[PDB]
Amino acid sequence: RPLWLPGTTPPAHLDGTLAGDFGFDPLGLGQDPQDLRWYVQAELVHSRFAMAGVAGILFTDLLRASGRTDIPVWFEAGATKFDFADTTTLFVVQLILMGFVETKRWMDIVKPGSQAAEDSFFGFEAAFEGLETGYPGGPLFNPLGFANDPTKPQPLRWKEIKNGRLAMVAMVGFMVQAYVTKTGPIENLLTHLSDPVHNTII
Amino acid sequence: DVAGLTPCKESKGFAKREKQEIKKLESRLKLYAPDSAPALALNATIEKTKRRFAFYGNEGLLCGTDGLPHLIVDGDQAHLGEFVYPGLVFLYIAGWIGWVGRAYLIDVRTSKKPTEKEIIIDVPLALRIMSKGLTWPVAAIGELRSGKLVEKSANITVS
Amino acid sequence: EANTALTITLSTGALLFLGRFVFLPFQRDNVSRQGLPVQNGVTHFDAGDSRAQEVTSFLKTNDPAGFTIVDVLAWGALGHAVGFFILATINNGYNPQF
Amino acid sequence: MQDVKTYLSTAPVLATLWFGFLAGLLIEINRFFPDALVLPL
Amino acid sequence: EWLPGNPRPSYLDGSAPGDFGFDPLGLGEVPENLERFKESELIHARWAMLAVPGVLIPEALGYGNWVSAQKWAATPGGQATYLGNPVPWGNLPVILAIEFLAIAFAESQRNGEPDPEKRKYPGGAFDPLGFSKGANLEELKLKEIKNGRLALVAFLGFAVQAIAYPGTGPLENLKTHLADPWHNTIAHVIIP
Amino acid sequence: GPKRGSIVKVLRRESYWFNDTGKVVAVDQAPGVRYPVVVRFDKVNYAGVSTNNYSPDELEAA
Amino acid sequence: AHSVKIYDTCIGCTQCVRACPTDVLEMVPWDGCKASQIASAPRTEDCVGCKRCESACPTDFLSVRVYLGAETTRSMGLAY
Numbered sequence A: 001r002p003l004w005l006p007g008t009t010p011p012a013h014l015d016g017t018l019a020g021d022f023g024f025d026p027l028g029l030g031q032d033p034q035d036l037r038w039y040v041q042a043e044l045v046h047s048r049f050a051m052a053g054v055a056g057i058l059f060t061d062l063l064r065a066s067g068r069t070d071i072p073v074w075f076e077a078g079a080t081k082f083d084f085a086d087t088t089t090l091f092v093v094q095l096i097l098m099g100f101v102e103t104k105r106w107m108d109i110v111k112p113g114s115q116a117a118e119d120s121f122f123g124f125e126a127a128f129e130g131l132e133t134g135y136p137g138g139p140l141f142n143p144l145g146f147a148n149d150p151t152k153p154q155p156l157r158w159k160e161i162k163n164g165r166l167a168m169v170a171m172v173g174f175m176v177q178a179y180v181t182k183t184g185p186i187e188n189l190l191t192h193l194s195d196p197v198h199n200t201i202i
Numbered sequence B: 001d002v003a004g005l006t007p008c009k010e011s012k013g014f015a016k017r018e019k020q021e022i023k024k025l026e027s028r029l030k031l032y033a034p035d036s037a038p039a040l041a042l043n044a045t046i047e048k049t050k051r052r053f054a055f056y057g058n059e060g061l062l063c064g065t066d067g068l069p070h071l072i073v074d075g076d077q078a079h080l081g082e083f084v085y086p087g088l089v090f091l092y093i094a095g096w097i098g099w100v101g102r103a104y105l106i107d108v109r110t111s112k113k114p115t116e117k118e119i120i121i122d123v124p125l126a127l128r129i130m131s132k133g134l135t136w137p138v139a140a141i142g143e144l145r146s147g148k149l150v151e152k153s154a155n156i157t158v159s
Numbered sequence C: 001e002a003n004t005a006l007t008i009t010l011s012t013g014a015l016l017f018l019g020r021f022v023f024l025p026f027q028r029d030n031v032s033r034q035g036l037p038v039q040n041g042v043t044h045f046d047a048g049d050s051r052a053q054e055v056t057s058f059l060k061t062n063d064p065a066g067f068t069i070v071d072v073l074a075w076g077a078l079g080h081a082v083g084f085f086i087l088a089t090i091n092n093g094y095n096p097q098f
Numbered sequence D: 001m002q003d004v005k006t007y008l009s010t011a012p013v014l015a016t017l018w019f020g021f022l023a024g025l026l027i028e029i030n031r032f033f034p035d036a037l038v039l040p041l
Numbered sequence E: 001e002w003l004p005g006n007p008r009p010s011y012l013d014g015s016a017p018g019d020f021g022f023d024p025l026g027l028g029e030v031p032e033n034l035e036r037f038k039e040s041e042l043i044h045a046r047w048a049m050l051a052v053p054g055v056l057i058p059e060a061l062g063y064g065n066w067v068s069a070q071k072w073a074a075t076p077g078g079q080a081t082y083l084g085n086p087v088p089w090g091n092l093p094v095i096l097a098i099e100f101l102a103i104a105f106a107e108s109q110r111n112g113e114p115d116p117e118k119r120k121y122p123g124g125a126f127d128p129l130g131f132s133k134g135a136n137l138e139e140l141k142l143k144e145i146k147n148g149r150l151a152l153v154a155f156l157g158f159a160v161q162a163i164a165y166p167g168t169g170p171l172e173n174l175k176t177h178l179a180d181p182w183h184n185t186i187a188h189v190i191i192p
Numbered sequence F: 001g002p003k004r005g006s007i008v009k010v011l012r013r014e015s016y017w018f019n020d021t022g023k024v025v026a027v028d029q030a031p032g033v034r035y036p037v038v039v040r041f042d043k044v045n046y047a048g049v050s051t052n053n054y055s056p057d058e059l060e061a062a
Numbered sequence G: 001a002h003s004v005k006i007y008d009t010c011i012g013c014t015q016c017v018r019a020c021p022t023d024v025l026e027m028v029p030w031d032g033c034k035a036s037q038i039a040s041a042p043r044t045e046d047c048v049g050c051k052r053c054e055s056a057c058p059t060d061f062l063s064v065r066v067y068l069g070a071e072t073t074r075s076m077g078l079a080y
C-alpha cells in the first residue's frame, strides 16, 4: 500500500485493514491499544462534525456571492444575531440535548451494548448495526441500508474519512482566513483568482 | 478602573514620564552634528522610545498614581495579555523541555553504559525525542491514564 | 417590660426537664463509655493521687433515675445561661435582617 | 572523524552550542520585537 | 440502573428498595456507613416530602413567600397564619422554645432503636391503617423512595431559585417561565 | 538460598540498596554462615562499593 | 573512653585493624563468615575517635561502629 512518505519505515501499532490507513504516526501519538481504539472514534466524529461544518459554511457564502439569499456570513451568523431565542438559552438547551446522545455513544464505546431503546420500546425498537467500532445503524441512523457488507465497505469507509480530513483542514482554513482577512472565504478565493501572484499571506 | 488605576492612554503622569525622557535624550543629542554616528544612534533611541510609549496606551494597561504600568494578574478577561496568555505558552515550553528530558532519560537507562550516555549525548536519539516532544500534553495525560507515569517500589530507607 | 423571675425560672425548668427526662440515658451511656481519665493504661487515682478520687459522699443520691447533685448543678447552670442570654436580648430592639 | 563527532557530543560543547543558539534567537527577537510587556494576542 | 449496561459495586447489588447502583464517589464502601446512610436518606426524603406542600400551598392560599413568611422577625409583630389571623402565642422566644423541646423529645425517642428495619420502617402506631401488613410492600418502598428523591431535588431547586431570584418564590418563577420560555431560563444566572 | 544469576530485591532496612534489585553472584553453602548470599548491584553507595552479602531471609522478591 | 562495637557482619577484611593508628582493634577467631575471623576492640581506652576504622569496612552500612563518649587525656590526643 502507499504511505505518506515513500521512504516508508512504517510503524507497528498500525499495520493494515484500518479504514483510511497510510502509516502516518510519526509522533508515536497512539501506540497503546486503548489509544488507537479511542483515536479511531475521535477521528471519526471529528471528520463528521467538520464535514457538517463545511457543508454549512460553503453553501451559504457561495449562494450569497451568486445572489440567492441574504443570510449573514459564517463568522457573523452566530455573532450577535437575535433570531428566535436568547443565544445562551439555546446553548444550554443544546448542551442538555447533546448530553443524552454523547453519553449513549460513550456507553457503546466502552461497553458495546446500547442498541435497545427505552420507554416500553423494548420490542421492535432495536438498533440493527452490530459493527466493529462506532458505526451505528437502523432507520434512525442508516435508513437506506447502504452499509451492506463487511470486508468490502473499505471503499466507502475510506471515502468517509478521506473527505473528513479535507473538511477539517478546510475548516481550520476558514477560521484562520476569516480571522486574518476579516472577509468571507469565497470572497477571499475570488480576490485570489483576480491576481494570484499578489494575493498571498500578507 | 479595577484597583483604582486609570488606563495609561489617559494618565496625566505618563505624559511627563515620556516628555522628560525625550527632553533628556534631546539634551544628549545637541552635543553633536546631525550627520554623525552619535546623532543617528540617539535619534534611533528617541524613535524607539516613542514606539514603546505608543504601544502601552493602545494595549490597555492601567497606569498608577506615579505614571507607571501595573499588571492585573487576576484572571480579568480585559487583561489576559498580561499573565495567563504568556503563562500558557511558557507552561507549554517548560512541559516540552521536561517531557523530552524525561523521555531521553527513560530511553538511555536501558542501554549498556547508561552513565556514559549522560556525559556524551547521542545527538540522533536526542534529536528524535526533541522532535517528538511537540505533543507532550497528549502524551503525559496518556501515560497518566495508562498507569505508566509513576513507580511504586521506590528505594527510600530510614531506620 | 422584660420580667425576669419568670423567664429565667422557665429556662431553668426547661433545661432541667431536658436533663432529667429526655437526655438522661444518652448522658449516662456517654459517660460510662469514656469512664475515667487514664494515664499509661490506668486511671489517675490508681496511678497514685490522693486528689484524683471521686466523691461518692457527694454523689450518693436517691432520685429513681440517679440524678445526683452535680447533674442538677450542670443543667441549672445551662438553664441560667440560656435564661440570661434570652433576657439580655429582648431589652434592646433591633432590625438585623437581610 | 568519528572521534571528532564523539568529542562534539560532549556535555560542555553541546551546552555552549545550545545556549549560544538560544541567546542568538532571543537577541534577534528582542531586536525585532522590543519592549514587550503585554502579549498583544 | 442509572447507566444502562454499567456494572454495580460489591455493595450495591440492588437488594435494597429504590436501589439502582449510583455510587461514583464510592461512599458506601464501608458497611456501617451505608447502613447509616440509608436511614439518613430516608429521613431527608420524608422531611422534603413534608416540606414541598408546606411551601407550595401557603403562597397560593395564605399568600406568603416562604422566605418572607419567616421575615416577620427582627420587627415586633407578624406571626401570620392560614387565614392571616395573627397567632397570639407566636412570640419568637416562646415559640422557638417549644419548637426546640418537642423536636428534641421526638428525636431522642426515635434515636433509641437497635433494629435498623424498625429504625427506618417503624410501623406500629406509625402505620395505623395496615398499609404494610402483608400486601405489596417492596413496591410501596420503591414508590416512597422515588417520590422522596424527587422531593429532595425539588427542594434543592427551591433553595437555589430563591437565591438566584431574591425576594420571590418558586411559583412566580413558573409564570416567568410561561411568559417567555425562550428568554427566561437558567441561562441568565449561569451565563450573565 | 536463591539461585545464581537470580534478580532479587533487598529488604534490609539499613541498606543503601533497600527496595532495589540485584543479581546474585554465588551463595556460600557452608553450615554456619550467617549471611551467605552475595549480590552485586549496578549503583555504588556513598562508600563506592557495589557488592554485598545478605542472609536468605533478608531479601527476596524475584 | 569511646565505645567501639563490632556487629556480626564482619567478613574478616582485616582492614579495620590495619587502619586504626592506636593498636585498638585486633583479629580474633570466630567461625561464621568465611575464614573464622572477626574484629575485636579490647583496647577501647586508647581510641581517639579517628573513625579510620569505619572508613574502611566495606560492609552494607557498617560492621564496626565508634560512639564518642567521655573525654580523657588519651582520647583527646594531647601531648602536653
Ligand SMILES: CC(/C=C/C=C(C)/C=C/[C@@]12O[C@]1(C)C[C@@H](O)CC2(C)C)=C\C=C\C=C(C)\C=C\C=C(C)\C=C\[C@@]12O[C@]1(C)C[C@@H](O)CC2(C)C
Residues within 6 Å of the ligand: A024, A025, A026, A027, A028, A029, A046, A047, A049, A050, A052, A053, A054, A056, A057, A074, A075, A077, A078, A168, A169, A171, A172, B135
Ligand atoms: C472538527 C473541526 C471543525 C468543526 C467545525 C464546525 C463544527 C463548525 C461549526 C460552525 O460553522 C458552523 C457549522 C456554523 C457557524 O455559524 C457556527 C460554527 C460553529 C462556526 C475541525 C477539526 C480540525 C482538525 C484538524 C485541523 C487536525 C489537524 C491534524 C493534523 C494536521 C495532524 C495531526 C496529527 O495527528 C496526526 C495526523 C499524526 C500525529 O503524529 C501528528 C499530529 C499533528 C498530532
Ligand SMILES: CC1=C(/C=C/C(C)=C/C=C/C(C)=C/C=C/C=C(C)/C=C/C=C(C)/C=C/C2=C(C)CCCC2(C)C)C(C)(C)CCC1
Residues within 6 Å of the ligand: B073, B074, B075, B084, B094, B095, B096, B097, B098, B099, B102, B140
Ligand atoms: C487558574 C488561575 C489561577 C489559579 C491557579 C491555581 C490555584 C493553580 C493550582 C494548581 C494546583 C493545585 C496544582 C496541582 C499540582 C499538580 C500535581 C499534583 C501534579 C504534578 C504534575 C506533574 C506530575 C507533572 C508532570 C510533568 C510534566 C507534565 C511535564 C514534564 C515535567 C513533569 C514530568 C514534572 C490564578 C489565580 C493564579 C490566575 C488565574 C487563573
Ligand SMILES: CC1=C(/C=C/C(C)=C/C=C/C(C)=C/C=C/C=C(C)/C=C/C=C(C)/C=C/C2=C(C)CCCC2(C)C)C(C)(C)CCC1
Residues within 6 Å of the ligand: C012, C016, C072, C073, C074, C075, C076, C077, C078, C080, C081, C084
Ligand atoms: C426534690 C424534688 C423535686 C424538686 C426539685 C427542685 C425544686 C429542683 C430545683 C432546681 C433548681 C431551682 C435548680 C437551680 C439551679 C441553679 C444553678 C445551678 C445556677 C447556676 C447559675 C450559673 C452558673 C450562672 C452563671 C452566670 C453568672 C454567675 C454571671 C452571669 C453569667 C452566667 C449567667 C453564666 C421534684 C418536685 C422535681 C420531684 C420530687 C423531688
Ligand SMILES: CC1=C(/C=C/C(C)=C/C=C/C(C)=C/C=C/C=C(C)/C=C/C=C(C)/C=C/C2=C(C)CCCC2(C)C)C(C)(C)CCC1
Residues within 6 Å of the ligand: B055, B071, B082, B083, B086, D032, D033, D034, D035, D036, D037, D038, D039, D040
Ligand atoms: C506584537 C508586537 C510587539 C510585541 C511583542 C511580542 C510578540 C512579545 C510577547 C511576549 C510578551 C509580552 C511576554 C512577556 C510577558 C510576561 C509577563 C508580563 C509576565 C510577568 C509576570 C510574572 C512572571 C509574574 C511573576 C511571578 C510571581 C510574581 C509569583 C511567582 C510566579 C511568577 C514567577 C509567575 C511589540 C510590542 C514589540 C511591537 C508591536 C508588535
